[PDB]
C-alpha cells in the first residue's frame with residue numbers, strides 16, 4: 001500500500017519537521033520526487049502497527065532505542081552506506097544503530113536532557129536535587145516555582161531514577177541481560193521516592209505534562225525545566241534569559257539521562273529504498289541538510305563530524321555533551337519498548353499516589369522482566385484458541401504472570417486447551 005516514486009517521512013512533532021521539509025524541497029528541486037514530511041501522534045507505536053501490514057512511511061525518525069524492536073519484527077531494511085560515507089559520522093553513532101551485526105538506520109544526532117534555568121529568577125542553579133525543596137519555598141514567596149518538567153513520559157524522570165543505581169537491563173560481557181532488570185533496586189526507589197516527595201510537599205504537580213512545563217518555563221513562571229535540545233528554539237522566541245547546564249546530583253551522584261541517537265530507518269516494505277538512501281546520504285546528512293533541520297529545532301550534537309565541529313562551541317551543546325557523558329546510550333534491544341511502558345506506569349501511579357513507590361516499581365520490574373513470556377503466550381493464544389471467551393480469559397491470566405514458572409504453568413493450560 002506504500003506508493004512508488006515518492007517519499008513519505010515520519011518524524012516526531014517536537015523535532016524540526018519544517019526544516020526537514022526544506023531538505024525535501026531541495027530533493028524535489030533536484031530530482032522531481034515529492035517528499036512529504038508528516039508528524040503523526042504516537043508515531044513510535046503507530047509505525048510497527050502499520051508497517052507489519054506492509055504499510056506506513058518510507059522513512060521513520062525516532063531515537064535508536066525503538067529500532068531493534070522494529071528490526072526484530074522485520075520492519076526495517078538493512079542500510080548499505082559505503083566506507084567513505086560511514087567515515088563521515090562518529091563511529092559510536094553507528095554502534096547505536098547496529099542490531100545483530102547489521103546497520104538498521106542512519107544516525108542523525110546525539111540527544112541528552114539538560115537542566116534549563118531562567119537566569120533572571122535563578123542566577124546560580126542548584127548543583128543538587130536535595131536543595132530544590134528549599135529553593136521552591138523561596139520562589140513560591142515571589143509567586144514562582146523552582147522546577148517544572150514532563151512527569152507523563154519516563155524519559156524525563158529516568159535521570160533521577162538512575163542517579164543512585166536504577167538501570168534498565170544489566171550489561172554483562174558485550175550483551176544486555178534481559179533477565180536482569182534494575183527498576184526496583186534501592187537506587188531506583190530512592191530516586192522515585194525523592195520525586196514523589198516533591199509532589200507530596202507540593203513542589204511539583206503530578207499532572208504536569210510536556211506542554212504545561214514548556215509554557216510555564218517559556219512564560220517565566222518557573223525557574224527551571226528539564227528538556228532536550230529540540231526545546232531551545234521556543235525558549236529563544238520567548239525572550240526568557242536562559243542557560244543550559246549539568247543536571248543536579250542526587251545523593252552526591254550525577255543524574256544519568258538515557259542518551260538517544262535520533263536515527264532514520266527505511267521501511268522494509270518501501271518500494272523507494274534507493275530514493276530513501278539518496279535523500280538520507282546526499283541531502284540530509286550533509287552540512288546543508290542538518291543546518292536546515294537544526295535551524296528549525298536544534299538537533300543536539302550531530303553525528304556528522306564536519307557539522308558537529310562547527311556547532312560545538314555553543315555552550316548549550318557543551319552542556320548536552322556533559323550530560324550525555326554522565327548518562328548512558330540506550331540499548332536498542334526489542335525489550336526496550338516493554339521497559340519504557342512499565343516505567344511509564346510506575347512513575348504515573350507513584351506520582352498520582354495510586355500506588356506506593358515500592359509497589360509501583362515492583363510491578364514495573366515484573367512487567368519488564370516477564371514481557372517476553374507474556375508476548376509469547378498472547379501470540380500462542382491468538383493462533384491456537386478459537387473460542388473467543390476462552391481466549392479472553394487466557395489473556396486475563398497472561399496479565400498475571402510474575403515469572404518463568406507462572407509462564408510454564410499457563411502455557412500448559414493453553415496447549416492442553418488447544419488440543420481438546
Ligand SMILES: OC[C@H]1O[C@H](O[C@H]2[C@H](O)[C@@H](O)[C@@H](O)O[C@@H]2CO)[C@H](O)[C@@H](O)[C@@H]1O
Pocket residue numbers: 012014044063064065066111153154155156228260340
Ligand atoms: O518516555 C519514554 C520514551 O523516551 C524516549 O523518547 C524521547 C525521545 O528519545 C526524544 O527524542 C524526545 O522526543 O522525547 C521522547 C520522550 O517523550 C525513547 O526514545 C522512547 O522510545 C521512549 O518511549
